[PDB]
Amino acid sequence: WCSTCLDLACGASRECYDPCFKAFGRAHGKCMNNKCRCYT
């Protein structure tokens, strides 16, 4: 299926930016399936 995906339901940039930047490293992802999917 996927890999760089967070269990956080998108809806707010900072909400998915803080985690994606602290989990994967860089803040660069999108909101797919109502969930923020970080990609590079």
Structure tokens at 7: 């269990």
Number of domains comprising the chain? 1
- Specify burial of residue 21 (Cβ count, 10 A radius: 0-12, 13-18, 19+): middle
Identify the CA nearest to 21 among candidates 9, 11, 2, 36. Answer: 36
Range of the domain at 29: 1-40
Strands (E), 1-40: 5-9, 29-32, 35-38
Contacts of 22 (CB under 8 A, 6+ apart): none
The single residue listed with the structure tokens 């269990």 is: 7
CATH code: domain of residue 4 = 3.30.30.10
The single residue listed with the structure tokens 């803080």 is: 18
